[PDB]
C-alpha cells in the first residue's frame, strides 16, 4: 500500500441486511433493511459510501448471492463516473465471493488488478457509528456519500499510521462496541466535531487509546 498507485478496499459485507423476527405464529420473517458498500482509499482516507436501498431486492431471490453482483455493478458504475486519473489501479476485496463478479464487471478496465485479502477490516462496525448508522437506516433511495475517515489526522501522521489507527478502531468497535466507545471517550469533555467521524484527542491520548484498542482486540 501507499505508493503512487490508487488502491481501493471494497467491503460488500453490509449490502444485504435483514431483520429476523419470530412471529406470534412461530415462523421467522427476514425483512430487508438498507445496506451499504464501503469503498475505501487507505492512502487518503477517502470513503465512498454507496447506500443500498431495499427497493433493489423487490421481486428477487437468493438476495445474499445477488448482493455480490449488485456490489460489482456499483463499483463499475463508480469507476465509470470518475476520470481515468482518479480510477483505482488495484481493488482489494475483503471477501472472496466478490472476485468473480468484479472480474466480469470490470472487463473494460484492463489496467485494474483485482485481488482478495485475509485482512480483518470490519466496516460493519461503522453501522454502530451514529453518523453512518442513521444515514443508512433512514435512506429512502440509493445514493452515494463521501467521507474522510481520517478526519484531520494526516496533518500530523502518515497514511500508514492513520490506516493502522482506523483498523484498530474498527476492529475494537466490532469486538466490543460498548468498551471501544468508552476507550474512545477518555474525558467527560471529549468531543467529536460535527464533520468528523472520530474524537478530537491529543497525541498522548491517541497513544493510550491505540494500546487499549489493541488489548481489547487481543482479549477477543
Ligand atoms: Cl464471500
Ligand atoms: Cl449511488
UniProtKB/Swiss-Prot annotation:
Species of provenance: Homo sapiens (Human)
Tissue specificity note: Widely expressed.
Stated role: Plays a role in pre-mRNA splicing as core component of precatalytic, catalytic and postcatalytic spliceosomal complexes, both of the predominant U2-type spliceosome and the minor U12-type spliceosome. Functions as a scaffold that mediates the ordered assembly of spliceosomal proteins and snRNAs. Required for the assembly of the U4/U6-U5 tri-snRNP complex, a building block of the spliceosome. Functions as a scaffold that positions spliceosomal U2, U5 and U6 snRNAs at splice sites on pre-mRNA substrates, so that splicing can occur. Interacts with both the 5' and the 3' splice site.
Protein name: Pre-mRNA-processing-splicing factor 8
Subunit structure: Part of the U5 snRNP complex. Component of the U4/U6-U5 tri-snRNP complex composed of the U4, U6 and U5 snRNAs and at least PRPF3, PRPF4, PRPF6, PRPF8, PRPF31, SNRNP200, TXNL4A, SNRNP40, DDX23, CD2BP2, PPIH, SNU13, EFTUD2, SART1 and USP39. Component of the U5.U4atac/U6atac snRNP complexes in U12-dependent spliceosomes. Within the minor spliceosome, which acts on U12-type introns, interacts with PPIL2 and RBM48. Core component of U2-type precatalytic, catalytic and postcatalytic spliceosomal complexes. Found in a mRNA splicing-dependent exon junction complex (EJC) with SRRM1.
Compartment(s) where it occurs, according to its Swiss-Prot or TrEMBL record: Nucleus; Nucleus speckle
Ranges where the record places region Involved in interaction with pre-mRNA 5' splice site: 1-220
Illness the protein is tied to: Retinitis pigmentosa 13: A retinal dystrophy belonging to the group of pigmentary retinopathies. Retinitis pigmentosa is characterized by retinal pigment deposits visible on fundus examination and primary loss of rod photoreceptor cells followed by secondary loss of cone photoreceptors. Patients typically have night vision blindness and loss of midperipheral visual field. As their condition progresses, they lose their far peripheral visual field and eventually central vision as well.
Domain notes: The MPN (JAB/Mov34) domain mediates interaction with TSSC4 and SNRNP200. Has structural similarity with deubiquitinating enzymes, but lacks the residues that would bind the catalytic metal ion.
RNase H homology domain: region residues: 1-220
Effect of residue 18 to D: Strongly reduced interaction with RNA
Shown segment, full-protein numbering: 1771 to 1990 of 2335
Name of the encoding gene: PRPF8
Amino acid at each position: 500500500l501507499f505508493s503512487n498507485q490508487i488502491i481501493w478496499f471494497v467491503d460488500d459485507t453490509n449490502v444485504y441486511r435483514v431483520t429476523i423476527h419470530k412471529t406470534f405464529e412461530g415462523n421467522l420473517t427476514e425483512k430487508p433493511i438498507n445496506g451499504a458498500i464501503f469503498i475505501f482509499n487507505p492512502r487518503t482516507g477517502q470513503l465512498f459510501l454507496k447506500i443500498i436501498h431495499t427497493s433493489v431486492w423487490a421481486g428477487q431471490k437468493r438476495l445474499g448471492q445477488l448482493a455480490k453482483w449488485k456490489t460489482a455493478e456499483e463499483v463499475a458504475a463508480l469507476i465509470r463516473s470518475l476520470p481515468v486519473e482518479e480510477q483505482p489501479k488495484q481493488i482489494i476485496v475483503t471477501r472472496k465471493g466478490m472476485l468473480d463478479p468484479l472480474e466480469v464487471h470490470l472487463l473494460d478496465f484492463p489496467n485494474i488488478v483485482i485481488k482478495g485479502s485475509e485482512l480483518q477490516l470490519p466496516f460493519q462496525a461503522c453501522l454502530k457509528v451514529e453518523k453512518f448508522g442513521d444515514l443508512i437506516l433512514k435512506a429512502t433511495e440509493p445514493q452515494m456519500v463521501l467521507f474522510n475517515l481520517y478526519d484531520d489526522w494526516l496533518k500530523t501522521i502518515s497514511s500508514y499510521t492513520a490506516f493502522s489507527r482506523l483498523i484498530l478502531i474498527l476492529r475494537a468497535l466490532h469486538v466490543n462496541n460498548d468498551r471501544a466507545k468508552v476507550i474512545l471517550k477518555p474525558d467527560k469533555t471529549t468531543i467529536t466535531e460535527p464533520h468528523h467521524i472520530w474524537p478530537t484527542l491529543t497525541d498522548e491520548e491517541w497513544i493510550k487509546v491505540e494500546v487499549q484498542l489493541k488489548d481489547l482486540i487481543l482479549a477477543d
